[PDB]
Design a protein around this nucleic acid. Structure first.
Ligand SMILES: [Mg+2]
Ligand SMILES: [Mg+2]
Ligand SMILES: [Mg+2]
Ligand SMILES: [Mg+2]
Ligand SMILES: [Mg+2]
Ligand SMILES: [Mg+2]
Ligand SMILES: [Mg+2]
Ligand SMILES: [Mg+2]
Ligand SMILES: [Mg+2]
Ligand SMILES: [Mg+2]
Ligand SMILES: [Mg+2]
Ligand SMILES: [Mg+2]
Ligand SMILES: [Mg+2]
Ligand SMILES: [Mg+2]
Ligand SMILES: [Mg+2]
Ligand SMILES: [Mg+2]
Ligand SMILES: [Mg+2]
Ligand SMILES: [Mg+2]
Ligand SMILES: [Mg+2]
Ligand SMILES: [Mg+2]
Ligand SMILES: [Mg+2]
Ligand SMILES: [Zn+2]
Ligand SMILES: [Zn+2]
Lengths: 38, 177, 162, 261, 97
RNA sequence: GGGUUUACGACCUCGAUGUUGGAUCAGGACACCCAAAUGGUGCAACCGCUAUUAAAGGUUCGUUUGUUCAACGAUUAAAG
RNA sequence: AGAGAAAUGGGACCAACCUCACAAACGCGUCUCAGAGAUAAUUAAUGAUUUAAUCUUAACCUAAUUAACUCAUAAUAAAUCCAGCCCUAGAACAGGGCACA
């Protein structure tokens, strides 16, 4: 996970979901694309 | 009207015990009327130097209701005086620990900040449920109306009211719920 | 309404669909020329989270919302009704619109705290430990800003942050 | 009543005699403290709802004292009970099924060889002691120029706080306070003299009254199953216990002078 | 078709869709047939026999799956959605087989 | 965004707010050095590098130097 | 995953060693040190808006989960005798003993 201010999908398999009040770019193929909106 | 001096004085400055249901009621709206009745601002004979103050018995404190996300947001901060003794508890944790503490602190904050606050707080009786001793029950005079109208649930609605309410839309027969 | 039923008779699975009778719209609406259900039954800026008799018309038996393409509400009314159904579910109205779990109904937990006009979810909000001073005060949101257009008979605006 | 898994037993009030060495069969040498149960009697019983709402309270008295130095109320209470006055009076939280009738005697055979106990007593009071002996503070150097400071506490607070905190360690009373030693193992029970041999050190000076009870540690919560549940009744068995009940590892005085193999 | 291709249909013997194309409730069954007879579903297993029975007066569209566990899934689809039939068939295939 | 360094300003004190380092005692912040729970790695393993949460508790002994620092010796879970 | 040992710190204590020309104090010496809930980050189960999926600032119950923090639990917790004399109790005042002998 990388805590960022601006989330952006780095590939076509990244999905944006709202959990625990925050936004999260989750990626199953490339786990390094995990982003968390601060 | 044509009373003697001592009974007239007694009748005028007599104390009254009010009852207050706190089930599904906001603690601040409870504390408003509680503090008014505690100070005596409901008497046209009121004065700050007089001891005019009525007793308030609030029941069903455990069943109190908080608006919004206050149960998880509102914190209560205390300090034991010792270094490192600063505690901040969530309202939900404080309610789970001591049920009366929420409305107690609400009324304490709504009361005036003079030395009479402790005296008129001694005339406040809070109970978590409908379990009031007989000695206190035998003192009650009237019950104050609840400040918030509790809305009914869907199961608490009568079939007559449900059928009287119109169906605003028509679901399709081929849809599956 | 359509129901999917399954029949197991000796390693033979039969999936069947059964259509039952459904209630229709009331015959006399007050504004028949309105394209929208709410905005033609004149309930616009009238309902709230307490109006369960209106919020329960279009929801699934498990508390879920119904699609807009199936219901027919205008987008703003759909969002308002979605937030109102969320607030009712959080406040405790509509208690029979939950899934039946006979294994999970036995292990009782801490009693449910009574609440109403809850905007966020109780499992996502963090406690405000600082609370701010008078000039910079961390206000607590109450209700939704989507219901700011409702009719105010008293004339005072609704305090959405307190 | 029969024993239950969530039961609590009553305790005793003994006298700290002294310390003795005690060897175990593996060659190790421990130190035991001798607690003599002189006159232990259950004085009164307070019900659970009238004491705590969770567990009942049994009051136990210690060794006998003189009638001529007690007050009228204490003397009236002991006259109504039927016993001479006791010196130390303690309260033990027991369960509702382990209650005993007030006025019953309690003996050291209440505890059995091999068990863990809790021992409460007032520690040896050292009076108004300095900060170095009370809190273990380090002093200043002895002779490298220091002037009249070799045992002072030094700085007590910070300049910005403009005050000192309530938890400030400062000279004062040291010792005359109640402390509890946890998990002391019992090795030996002398039934003739009513003496208990508890492992290790016991708070308080010798010839002082000590409140002994079962160990409330979570590791020894269900040890009371094999012990006499209500108490030790010497007249119920109608058979005298041995003079000394030892543990399974204690080198008894009469021993073959164990040698390794 | 993709959800079936990512399922490993190797454990199915015969799938027959019997319907009448001149009815008003055969849309779901026709799309079910086209999804279960796609190219990916063909190439993931070549031992399966996909039959499309076309009648005129049957008036009851249905599907029958006999797979090598000795199992028979029979679904008379007159009001079910194609998506629901697909999910049911996929869940049953992944449960038994 | 913070107010740790140097500077800038000259607002409180010049009928006195005693000025560096050490000894004693430390309070607190977290922008966590250790200990704890995890995410990503160009993470094979042992070692690592980053990021998230967490401040109840710890954070060594010596030579030189008045030294804070700094170099060096031996360790520690770490020597914030 | 399973067994032990030790150090630090909290609280205590002299059977022995050591300081020890008072009977005591003392370390260099000895004894003991704990259960439940709770969470933040982060994982998955069911499931609509968005009849698929989706840990949910969607409801229902969910489970694996840091340190804090609270609570089980422990300590104190018998009021109006106190002249004098002792004390392992103490600056004073307090506190424990004074019938066995
Ligand atoms: Mg002394
Ligand atoms: Mg020294
Ligand atoms: Mg000098
Ligand atoms: Mg000197
Ligand atoms: Mg000098
Ligand atoms: Mg100050
Ligand atoms: Mg500064
Ligand atoms: Mg500048
Ligand atoms: Mg100036
Ligand atoms: Mg100027
Ligand atoms: Mg000056
Ligand atoms: Mg001056
Ligand atoms: Mg400090
Ligand atoms: Mg942090
Ligand atoms: Mg670490
Ligand atoms: Mg620290
Ligand atoms: Mg120690
Ligand atoms: Mg779904
Ligand atoms: Mg998944
Ligand atoms: Mg407690
Ligand atoms: Mg006395
Ligand atoms: Zn990606
Ligand atoms: Zn509309």
């Amino acid at each position: 996970f990388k805590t960022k201010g601006v989330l952006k999908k780095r590939c076509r398999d990244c999905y944006l979901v709202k959990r625990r009040g925050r936004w999260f770019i989750y990626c199953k193929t490339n786990p390094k694309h995990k982003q968390r909106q601060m | 009207s044509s009373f003697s001096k001592a009974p007239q004085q007694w009748a005028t400055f007599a104390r009254v015990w009010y009852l207050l249901d706190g089930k599904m009621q906001p603690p601040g709206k409870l504390a408003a009327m509680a503090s008014v009745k505690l100070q005596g601002l409901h008497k046209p004979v009121y004065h700050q130097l007089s001891d005019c103050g009525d007793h308030v018995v609030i029941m069903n404190t455990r069943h109190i209701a908080f608006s919004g996300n206050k149960w998880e947001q509102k914190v209560y901060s205390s300090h034991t005086g010792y270094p490192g003794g600063f505690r901040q508890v969530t309202a939900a944790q404080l309610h789970q620990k001591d049920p009366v503490a929420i409305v107690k602190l609400a009324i304490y904050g709504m009361l005036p900040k003079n030395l009479h606050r402790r005296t008129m707080m001694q005339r406040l009786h809070l109970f978590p449920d409908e379990d009031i001793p007989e000695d206190i029950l035998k003192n009650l005079v009237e019950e104050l109306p609840q400040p918030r109208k509790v809305p009914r649930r869907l199961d608490e609605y009568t079939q007559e009211e449900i059928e009287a309410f119109p169906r605003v839309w028509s679901p399709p027969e081929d849809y599956r719920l | 309404f359509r129901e999917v039923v399954e029949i197991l008779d000796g390693k033979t699975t039969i999936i069947e669909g059964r259509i039952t009778e459904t209630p229709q719209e009331s015959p006399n609406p007050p504004n028949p020329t309105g394209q929208c259900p709410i905005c033609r039954w004149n309930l616009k800026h009238k309902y709230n989270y307490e109006d369960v008799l209106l919020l329960s018309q279009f929801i699934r038996p498990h508390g879920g919302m119904l699609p807009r393409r199936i219901t027919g509400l205008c987008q703003e009314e759909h969002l308002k009704i979605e937030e109102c159904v969320k607030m009712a579910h959080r406040a405790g109205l509509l208690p029979n619109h939950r899934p039946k779990l006979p294994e999970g109904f036995v292990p009782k937990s801490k009693p449910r705290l009574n609440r109403y006009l809850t905007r966020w979810s109780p499992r996502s909000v963090k406690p405000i430990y600082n609370k701010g001073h008078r000039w910079n005060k961390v206000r607590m949101p109450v209700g939704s800003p989507l219901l700011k257009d409702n009719v105010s008979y008293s004339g005072r605006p609704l305090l959405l942050y307190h | 009543h029969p024993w239950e898994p969530g039961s609590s037993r009553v305790g005793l009030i003994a006298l700290k005699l002294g310390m003795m060495p005690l060897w175990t069969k593996d060659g190790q040498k421990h130190v035991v403290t001798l607690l003599q149960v002189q006159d232990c009697h259950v004085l009164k019983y307070t019900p659970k709802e009238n004491h705590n709402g969770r567990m009942a309270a049994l009051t136990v008295g210690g060794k006998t004292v003189s009638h001529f130095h007690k007050s009228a109320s204490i003397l009236e209470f002991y006259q109504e009970l039927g016993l001479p006055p006791k010196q130390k009076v303690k309260i033990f939280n027991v369960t509702e099924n382990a209650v005993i009738k007030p006025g019953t005697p309690l003996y050291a055979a209440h505890f059995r060889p091999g068990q863990y106990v809790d021992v409460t007593a007032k520690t040896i009071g050292k009076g108004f002691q300095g900060v170095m002996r009370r809190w273990g503070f380090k002093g200043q150097p002895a002779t490298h120029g220091q002037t009249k400071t070799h045992r002072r506490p030094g700085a007590i607070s910070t300049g910005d706080v403009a005050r000192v905190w309530p938890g400030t360690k400062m000279p004062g009373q040291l010792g005359n306070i109640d402390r509890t030693a946890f998990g002391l193992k019992v090795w030996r029970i002398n039934t003739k003299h009513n003496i208990i041999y508890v492992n290790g050190s016991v708070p308080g000076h010798k010839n002082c009254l000590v409140k002994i009870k079962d160990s409330k540690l979570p590791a020894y919560k269900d040890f009371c199953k094999n012990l006499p549940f209500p108490t030790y009744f010497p007249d119920g068995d109608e058979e005298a216990l041995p003079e000394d009940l030892y543990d399974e590892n204690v080198c008894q005085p009469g021993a073959p002078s164990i040698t390794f193999t | 078709a993709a959800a079936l291709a990512r399922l490993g249909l190797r454990a199915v013997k015969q799938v027959r869709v019997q319907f009448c194309p001149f009815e008003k409730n055969v849309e779901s069954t026709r799309t079910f047939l086209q999804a279960v007879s796609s190219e990916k579903v063909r190439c993931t297993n070549l031992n399966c026999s996909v039959i499309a029975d076309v009648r005129h007066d049957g008036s009851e569209p249905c599907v029958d799956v006999l797979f090598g566990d000795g199992h028979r899934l029979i679904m008379r689809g007159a009001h079910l959605t194609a998506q629901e039939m697909l999910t049911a068939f996929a869940s049953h295939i992944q449960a038994r087989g």
